[PDB]
Amino acid sequence: SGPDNGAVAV
Amino acid sequence: QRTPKIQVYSRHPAENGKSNFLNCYVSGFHPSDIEVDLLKNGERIEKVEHSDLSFSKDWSFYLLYYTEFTPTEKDEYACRVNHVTLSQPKIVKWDRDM
Amino acid sequence: MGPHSMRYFETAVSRPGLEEPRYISVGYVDNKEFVRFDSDAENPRYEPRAPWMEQEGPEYWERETQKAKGQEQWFRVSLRNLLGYYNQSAGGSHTLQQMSGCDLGSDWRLLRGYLQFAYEGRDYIALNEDLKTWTAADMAAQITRRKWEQSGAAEHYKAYLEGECVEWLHRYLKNGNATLLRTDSPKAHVTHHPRSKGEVTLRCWALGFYPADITLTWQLNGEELTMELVETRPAGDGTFQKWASVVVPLGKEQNYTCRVYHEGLPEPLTLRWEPP
Numbered sequence A: 001s002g003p004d005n006g007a008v009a010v
Numbered sequence B: 001q002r003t004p005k006i007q008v009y010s011r012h013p014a015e016n017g018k019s020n021f022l023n024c025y026v027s028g029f030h031p032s033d034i035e036v037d038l039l040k041n042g043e044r045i046e047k048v049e050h051s052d053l054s055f056s057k058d059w060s061f062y063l064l065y066y067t068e069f070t071p072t073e074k075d076e077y078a079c080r081v082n083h084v085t086l087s088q089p090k091i092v093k094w095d096r097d098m
Numbered sequence C: 001m002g003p004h005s006m007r008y009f010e011t012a013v014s015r016p017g018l019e020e021p022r023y024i025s026v027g028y029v030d031n032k033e034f035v036r037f038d039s040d041a042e043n044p045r046y047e048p049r050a051p052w053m054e055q056e057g058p059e060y061w062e063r064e065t066q067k068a069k070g071q072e073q074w075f076r077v078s079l080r081n082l083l084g085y086y087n088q089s090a091g092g093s094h095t096l097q098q099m100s101g102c103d104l105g106s107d108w109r110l111l112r113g114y115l116q117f118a119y120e121g122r123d124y125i126a127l128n129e130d131l132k133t134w135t136a137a138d139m140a141a142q143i144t145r146r147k148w149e150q151s152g153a154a155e156h157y158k159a160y161l162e163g164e165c166v167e168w169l170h171r172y173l174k175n176g177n178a179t180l181l182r183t184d185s186p187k188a189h190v191t192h193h194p195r196s197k198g199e200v201t202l203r204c205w206a207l208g209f210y211p212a213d214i215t216l217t218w219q220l221n222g223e224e225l226t227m228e229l230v231e232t233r234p235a236g237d238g239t240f241q242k243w244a245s246v247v248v249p250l251g252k253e254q255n256y257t258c259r260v261y262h263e264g265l266p267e268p269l270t271l272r273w274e275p276p
Helices: C051-055 C058-085 C141-151 C153-175
Strands: B005-010 B020-029 B035-040 B061-069 B077-082 B090-093 C005-013 C022-029 C032-038 C095-104 C110-119 C122-127 C134-136 C187-194 C199-209 C215-220 C240-249 C256-261 C269-271
Touching: B005 B077, B005 B090, B020 B035, B020 B077, B035 B061, C005 C058, C005 C153, C022 C058, C022 C153, C032 C051, C032 C058, C051 C153, C058 C095, C095 C153, C110 C153, C122 C141, C122 C153, C134 C141, C141 C153, C187 C256, C187 C269, C199 C215, C199 C256, C215 C240, C240 C256
Parallel strands: none
Antiparallel strands: B005 B020, B020 B061, B035 B077, B077 B090, C005 C022, C005 C095, C022 C032, C095 C110, C110 C122, C122 C134, C187 C199, C199 C240, C215 C256, C256 C269
16 A cells, blocks of 8 residues: 655655 | 666577567666667567656666567677667667576 | 566656656566556556456556646646756756666565655755654755655655555455566577687577576686676567677687576576587
């Protein structure tokens, strides 16, 4: 199950 | 430049007249777009298969191109790679000893 | 060889024009691909790449596919932001990559957590081994580092790595047991290639082995020799190949021994040139 990088982008 | 490394080799030890698989393993390149051809006596082999796009822990991409073939004494097999990091096509001949 | 591991390797490539980026996510268990998502597919979804993953029901595939759709959008926004940071042209070709994952310890807990990014194939920002601080590789990555220190991104990824990563890896190891426990031992042989100036190349081959982890060595009368070694390469059937060669004096070939170390073997193989 891969990560969810969330709402804040680079 | 992060040019594509190439290894050209057979799946099984080569014997003249015995069906096998010719591989061209291309790795260490960036960006991901690339053109890889397998050549027989300087002519592009059609319907060559390839693996799906993958990348290594140093971020560089790698692909396996392959086709069924039958080694012979005189037919010359090679891998030709075209990539934005190269100033010209990179041609590596198949050598059954390598 | 080594601790059990899970990794997700994710890539987004922007395409010139009004064309949206291509996003690919590949999952690995113990260095073998087990799932894949590609936005260029007719029906983009996560697919089982290791057949033991078909033990998962439709809810698993739906949830993971929805997650990939979210990641794809995060990579799209991130590519747009990176254009601004480096003052690049809006309709160009650029690549953003992520690596994430976990290694398991003897207590089935996280041993090492991994979370890093690259832009144009070069390090951009990485989570340090402490899972608390960030390494910005260049000056543009300082903008991201400040943004992520403010948003608490490290805590967010530390929770995934110590929890979900480790738990799902344990589930996949149980489901893939019958396949993951299989080893293919290398079949080895030595070939002889005469050279000029009374020299010979001896090449020790290791073929058809799985996993890819292997050691090839050459010894002269039992003493180690520090040899040309090619990079381990796929055979195309799921197994691997490697060879190691040495240049030896003509007439002294029998004084050299090749040794092959691989986990499928009950003991290391020792071999030498066998003339016909």
